[PDB]
Design a protein around this ligand. Structure first.
Ligand code: HEM
Ligand code: HEM
Lengths: 449, 451
């Protein structure tokens, strides 16, 4: 009945607990101490962190709870606008953009993005093929180069050309800095004035490039296999309306901000777990060699990479790279038969803890075992939620998993990997999670592309 | 390219090769002679037996192959209906029952069945505690009493009371006789001498239908809720169609649980105890775990999950003698198997599981040795090398039920008794729909630990 709560700091309540560079991992440790639910208070804010499948399955009842904009998402909305990820469900532009964009994110739609995904993936493989002996790979750095360029190409047929650069394209630099400012604002006024000025400058950089490309495309009339073409031509069946140019810009910004980092983090975590578990690596590499028999992988071949998909799902279980999502009670309701909630009360779903609920997964929750996902029928409802919940779940789920399966498959086909530093897992936190400083050596298998 | 085929008998092709009391073991010997794939032809039938992990990993590609009803499963369908095990993947009632029943067979659902499993397990232990000196145990007989009663209790809250009987409950007698008739039909053709078998077959079907239909009706009239599969099926709805199972299909599911689950599971327990008494060092390690883990008079669900080495013992017993010895597949489209065997759409495959599990390229040269340590890490075992529970979405829905039951019972057996192979038993594997060690007997000396 009475809800646990971590230590307080006088008038600041629990807020200083987030004044750390690893806040999700701090919240996980608190959940370990306090259990399936704890209250978290800040000045002008009350929320409750959920960690058990028992309670999270109720929170995922869409008749009782709707998506809430966390403070992180509210600050991201200052540059992602009413794009899909930072809109309320009841805003006209959410359902409109949802209806228009859903068919362009389906599994069947991945057939049309596949060639562009292969384009960037081959660039990644060629980079690693061209490394000199005993040079090494900066894994999250290269994975982020790949995912940003892939979303850039598939999103609006624009080449960031990240593999030609040490300093990223100015759009990416502003994007990363804007995300950092949004997340840094959480932990916090006269000293912050330069941050505010830079933030507005970074917003302008992103808007100017995306607005320019949209305008360029409308003037040219060119049709491509990208999401921008789909949005310029699509109409919502419900309203009969297309997306306007401002919302199209916010969607493109959203694809980049919401999709690039979770996906590069997943690839980096997956390669981390592979090099730490050589038996799993061998099994995954066998499949990649058996399935990817052509110099360029086909769409159908990627779907056959079953064990690679199991590797990726188990990596998402241990370290879901979007670590939380927020909900609010649509009306007064009782959670778990003992926690009465009032209309509008907020909940946070702490995904890494859900994925460690021993009542669902057994005692070996900390072990990396892709075989847990060998038969997807064994996974209970709402025990595994790396892509969120319900109608507000990740629209890019099929995109992310096709991208990651293709790239991981090509990596395992073309290289043997060495954990030459015996890397100690160090998880950097931004809006997302990724393994900082993860480096490997790759010895080519000398298979042509 | 060219596929081997065993010896033929003119117009009967390979069919007389199955006219034997031990057809799986005959097929294993054929695989030893012919290799990883051979064609097997009968009048109106062509299939291909696969024995290597190299080829079976491709056969398990669900994008290329779907479950086929073997002739055995087609004959079992005459009393198991469109229950889960004898229905095609494309039948509306397969996906419907699959979606409904999957949560009631999860590892989490075993927590709710545990008390009923303990109920029958305690009856088994008490039976053996009450034996007089130099009496012995008929192992497969007692294991089948246990598994049938356990499925009866967990399936529909019905007590067969097998430990109170020499003659089993009439449903069980009809069930066994129906399974025997289905398997006997394979070797036959159906001329006048077999007319009597048809008449018995229908009477046995009526016996099973009448009892199961009666219990369903009793439960609906009572409105009582139990912790059994029947209550779950009376109240469950398929999330996809929104429909519940009808009363006829619920009956077929209950019959399926008994016919499909009892014999494979009792066979596993009997084979496991056989291998333990034939390998005393392994038995000692397993008994040491049971004594260390089962510290209470009655095992808990959490304690059963802690019987790690017992679980490896069971998996290694399933490796050597998978009690459901085969499953059948058909090609969804034209495809090439292993880069050299072209298959046309609809072509059939049989997966010969005991031969798969003896693939030396996977397990090493010591394939015939009983070494539970092979299963210490599932990540070290290659894909599709170990398939005692079938494959994919048509895999055994009762896998967690079977392994929880077998782990609980074997753990209790090892805690409470020392076992003697007093006859130096010679392995003799009886073949029905399933495999089991016929005539396996032991003596049990009680450790005198109270329940
Ligand atoms: C491993 C990769 C990914 C993970 C783990 C992930 C995770 C998530 C999660 C948890 C949510 C729900 C957020 C909430 O409820 O507040 C979400 C929403 C969303 N994601 Fe992803 N995502 C991934 C990849 C992508 C990609 C590649 C894209 C775009 C190309 C994308 C675009 C979106 C969008 C637009 C939404 C909002 C959907 C809506 O509310 O209508 N994501 N994602
Ligand atoms: C050691 C014990 C067991 C073994 C070795 C075993 C083996 C198998 C195999 C190999 C299949 C696939 C058959 C095929 O593909 O044609 C299967 C399916 C099935 N088994 Fe078991 N089984 C065991 C225990 C059980 C139990 C205890 C139950 C029920 C309480 C059960 C119920 C089923 C059902 C319903 C199916 C069909 C599932 C579907 O296709 O949807 N089994 N079993």
């Amino acid at each position: 009945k009475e809800m646990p709560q971590p230590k307080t700091f006088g008038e600041l309540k629990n807020l200083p607990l987030l004044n750390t560079d690893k806040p999700v991992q701090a919240l996980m440790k608190i959940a370990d101490e306090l259990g399936e639910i704890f209250k978290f208070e800040a000045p002008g804010r009350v929320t409750r962190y959920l960690s058990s499948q028992r309670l999270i399955k109720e929170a995922c009842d869409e008749s009782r709870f709707d998506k809430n904009l966390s403070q992180a998402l509210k600050f991201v909305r200052d540059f992602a606008g009413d794009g899909l990820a930072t809109s309320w469900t009841h805003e006209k532009n959410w359902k409109k953009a949802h209806n228009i964009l859903l068919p362009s994110f389906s599994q069947q739609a991945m057939k049309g993005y596949h060639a562009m995904m292969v384009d960037i993936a081959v660039q990644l493989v060629q980079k690693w093929e061209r490394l000199n002996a005993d040079e090494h790979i900066e894994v999250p750095e290269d994975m982020t180069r790949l995912t940003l360029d892939t979303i850039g190409l598939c999103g609006f047929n624009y080449r960031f050309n990240s593999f030609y650069r040490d300093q990223p394209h100015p759009f990416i630099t502003s994007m990363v800095r804007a995300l950092d400012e949004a997340m840094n604002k959480l932990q916090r006024d006269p000293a912050y004035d330069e941050n505010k000025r830079q933030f507005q400058e970074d917003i302008k950089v992103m808007n100017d490039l995306v607005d320019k490309i949209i305008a360029d495309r409308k003037a040219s009339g060119e049709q491509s296999d990208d999401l921008l073409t789909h949005m310029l031509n699509g109409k919502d069946p419900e309203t009969g309306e297309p997306l306007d140019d401002e919302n199209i810009r916010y969607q493109i910004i959203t694809f980049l901000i919401a999709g690039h980092e979770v996906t590069s983090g997943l690839l980096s975590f997956a390669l981390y777990f592979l090099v730490k578990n050589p038996h799993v690596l061998q099994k995954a590499a066998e499949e990649a060699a058996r399935v990817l028999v052509d110099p360029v992988p086909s769409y159908k071949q990627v779907k056959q990479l079953k064990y690679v998909g199991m590797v990726l799902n188990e990596a998402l279980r241990l370290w879901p790279t979007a670590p939380a999502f927020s909900l609010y009670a649509k009306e007064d309701t009782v959670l778990g038969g003992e926690y009465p909630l009032e209309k509008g009360d907020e909940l946070m779903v702490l995904i890494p803890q859900l994925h460690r609920d021993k009542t669902i997964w057994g005692d070996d929750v900390e072990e990396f075992r892709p075989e847990r996902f060998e038969n997807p029928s064994a996974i209970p409802q709402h025990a595994f939620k790396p892509f969120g919940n319900g109608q507000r779940a990740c629209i890019g789920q099929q995109f992310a998993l096709h991208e990651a399966t293709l790239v991981l498959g090509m990596m395992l086909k073309h290289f043997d990997f060495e954990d030459h530093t015996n890397y100690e897992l160090d998880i950097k936190e931004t809006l997302t999670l990724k393994p900082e400083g993860f480096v490997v050596k790759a010895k080519s298998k000398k298979i042509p592309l």
